Amino acid sequence: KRSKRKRT
Amino acid sequence: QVFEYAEVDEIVEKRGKGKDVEYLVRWKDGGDCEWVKGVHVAEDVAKDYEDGLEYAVAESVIGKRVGDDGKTIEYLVKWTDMSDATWEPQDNVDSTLVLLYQQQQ
Amino acid sequence: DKIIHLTDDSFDTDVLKADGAILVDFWAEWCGPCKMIAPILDEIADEYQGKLTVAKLNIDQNPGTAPKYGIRGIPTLLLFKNGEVAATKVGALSKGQLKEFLDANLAGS
Ligand SMILES: [Ca+2]
């Protein structure tokens, strides 16, 4: 499903 | 009016301060963008945005390292959403995907 | 139980095919305000015993019934008379506000 990530 | 929206997908933008903060929210049932109050947003969704995180779909994990803190394991993840890989904590990455990394050995 | 835990499957038989008045609560475990009015409904079920039926629907286990009535916010209270919606309430409220709303709708029929 969905993974989280820093605001890039 | 005390309630929480049940169809909040993700928080796009923030334009408030303190307890009187407002979020730009995309819905899970209509896909429209409008401003709302942070009080009516679930704490889990709101927590992730304030932590500087965002939701995305991951292609695969290509790299693995020990974090700069020297305590936490980090993985390099390829994203469907964009062309560049990033380093994310082990908890932040899909559990089934990291198992795909073991086959690479 | 003096309250009813509804399912997407049983919602047709338990609510639509029932007689009298039925109060339905749309809630979730992660929902703050939903648990805020949770103890009130327990007291209500005792006081309005025999004159009303209190029921709940967990939208996580049952995400089918909720969008049927256009519920975008929780908690939401639906009052059913025979098979149809009479009046609805959106948001948390005090026990006094709930009784005023409740006594008003069952009076006029
Ligand atoms: Ca909350």
Author numbering:
A (entry chain F): 454 to 461
B (entry chain D): 265 to 369
C (entry chain A): 12 to 120
Provide the authors' original text about this structure.
As the interaction of CD3 with A3CT motif IV is rather weak and attempts to crystallize this minimal complex were not successful, we designed a fusion construct with the C terminus of CD2CD3 (residues 264–373) covalently linked (with a triple GS-linker (GS)) to A3CT motif IV (A3CT IV, residues 440–461), to increase the local concentration and to stabilize the interaction. However, as this construct did not result in crystals and motivated by recent success using carrier proteins in crystallization, we fused thioredoxin (Trx) with a single GS-linker to the N terminus of CD2CD3. This Trx–CD2CD3–IV construct could be crystallized and the structure was solved by molecular replacement at 2.8-Å resolution. The Trx–CD2CD3–IV structure contains two molecules in the asymmetric unit and comprises Trx residues 12–119, CD2CD3 residues 265–369 and A3CT residues 453–461. The N terminus of Trx (residues 1–11), the (GS)3-linker between CD2CD3 and A3CT IV and residues 440–452 of A3CT IV are disordered. The two chromodomains are rotated relative to each other by an angle of about 90° and are directly connected without a linker at Gly316. This tandem chromodomain arrangement exhibits a negatively charged and conserved surface in the CD2–CD3 interface that accommodates the highly positively charged motif IV (interface area of about 800 Å2). CD2 is found in an open (unliganded) chromodomain conformation, whereas CD3 adopts a closed conformation as seen for CD2 in complex with RRKRp25 (r.m.s.d. for closed conformations of 1.25 Å for 43 residues). In the CD2CD3–IV complex, A3CT IV adopts an extended conformation and a positively charged KRSKRKR sequence (residues 454–460) at its C terminus is threaded into CD3. While Trp343 forms a π-cation stacking with the guanidinium group of the arginine (in an orthogonal T-shaped geometry) the two other aromatic residues (tyrosines) of the classical cage are replaced by Glu318 and Asp345, which are involved in salt bridges with the caged arginine.
